[PDB]
Structure 1
Amino acid sequence: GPLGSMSEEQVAQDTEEVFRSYVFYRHQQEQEAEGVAAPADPEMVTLPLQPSSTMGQVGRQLAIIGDDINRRYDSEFQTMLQHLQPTAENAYEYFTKIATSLFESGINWGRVVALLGFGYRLALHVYQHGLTGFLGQVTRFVVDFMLHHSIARWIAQRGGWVAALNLGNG
């Protein structure tokens, strides 16, 4: 059929749907193939777009083509991502550095697809290994609330947290 007559900006907007579809179908295939050996990631189990849409079908097609091939690289990317130690805090920097290096010598369709595959692996790795940082955020919520709503003051007046060692001791 006819190719679209596209602005740069429209392609960028469409990339959101292509990537979310890709991620959904790739994760689903991997769960089906590997069972309990596939890392859980509930961020990936919703498909927030029309599956029959053009971009839905593009993302699915890329996942289907990569199904068996991608699994051959699991071992080496597990090792490289473990060495990289990505976190929610530093993921934008590393993503940008890696993508820049990927395309430094030019663009072709395979490198575009590899960028989506790397996005998938990065999102999975950070979630799977508990590098999402959310517990750290909740910790900051607790501390900030206690400082500014006089809870820390109340505890200080009663001898500090050490006073809580008496709880559970008759």
Structure 2
Amino acid sequence: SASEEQVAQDTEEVFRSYVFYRHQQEQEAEGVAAPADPEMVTLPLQPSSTMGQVGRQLAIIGDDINRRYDSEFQTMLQHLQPTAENAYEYFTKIATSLFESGINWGRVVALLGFGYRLALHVYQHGLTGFLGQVTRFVVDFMLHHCIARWIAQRGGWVAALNL
């Protein structure tokens, strides 16, 4: 019975954990061809917590289902400028488009995936210290766009461990 508030708070850990494990997965799948981002290795993590577990499962299942959203995110970000303002504008546009026709778990994973790709792009183009900002983009968007409320209604982030 996680409240909307609690779900909204949980998203920070879910996203950090998703980023960490997705990046570990990419390193496993790509080896030396994996895009480097040490920020994604050293971020705060609590692996055995529930939300740590959830982000990790979302990273594993996204490897399969998020493939097509990803391949585009990767093409369509190539053109983004590394300022905070461009980042935010681009984030808001894509995230709004993702949810225009409603919310489902696959689109939740897609948003996390987009956050991941956005954060990695801006880092590669020299904007350091911005991973926390993308996490904030995600947490806040999920809260104000009633994604947190939706999740809470499905049983909380813990409901994702079943996917």
Task: Return 140-149 or 114-123, whichever deviates more.
Answer: 140-149
Evaluate the alpha carbon distance shift between residue 76 and residue 17 of structure 1 in structure 2; reply closer, same or farther with a 3 A threshold.
same
Q: What TM-score, normalized to structure 2?
A: 0.71
User: CA, structure 1 residues 36+104, in 2 after alignment: closer, same or farther (shift >3 Å)?
Assistant: same
Residues 81 and 125, structure 1, Cα contact 8 Å, conserved in 2: yes
| Unmatched tracts of structure 1, length 5 or more | none
How far does residue 131 in structure 1 lie from its aligned partner after superposition? 4.2
Return 158-167 or 22-31, whichever deviates more: 158-167
Q: CA deviation at 1:49?
A: 2.8
Backbone CA RMSD of aligned residues: 19.4
Larger Rg: 1
Deviation at 1:36, TM superposition (A): 1.4
Percent identity between the aligned chains? 99
Q: Is the 8 A contact 1:87 1:132 kept in 2?
A: no
| Change beyond 3 A, Cα 1:41–1:156 | closer
Assess if the C-alpha contact under 8 Å between 1:62 and 1:113 holds in 2: yes
Does 2:74 align with 1:78? Answer: yes
Q: Cα deviation per residue 1:66-125 (whole Å; 9 max; x = unaligned)?
A: 225545665433321123445333212221222112111111111111111111010011
**TM superposition shift of 1:60:** 0.2
Runs of 4+ residues over 4 Å off in structure 1: 68-75, 131-167
- In structure 2, relative to structure 1, the CA distance for the partners of 1:130 and 1:166 (3 Å cut) is farther
Structure number with the bigger relative contact order (C-alpha 8 A, sep ≥ 6) is: 2
User: Are residues 1:116 and 2:112 paired?
Assistant: yes
Deviates more, 1:89-98 or 1:149-158: 149-158
* Offset of residue 39 of structure 1: 0.7
* CA distance in 1: counterparts of 2:153 and 2:22, whole angstroms: 56
CA distance in 1, matches of 2:31, 2:87: 28
Q: Retained in 2: the 8 A contact 1:14–1:55?
A: yes
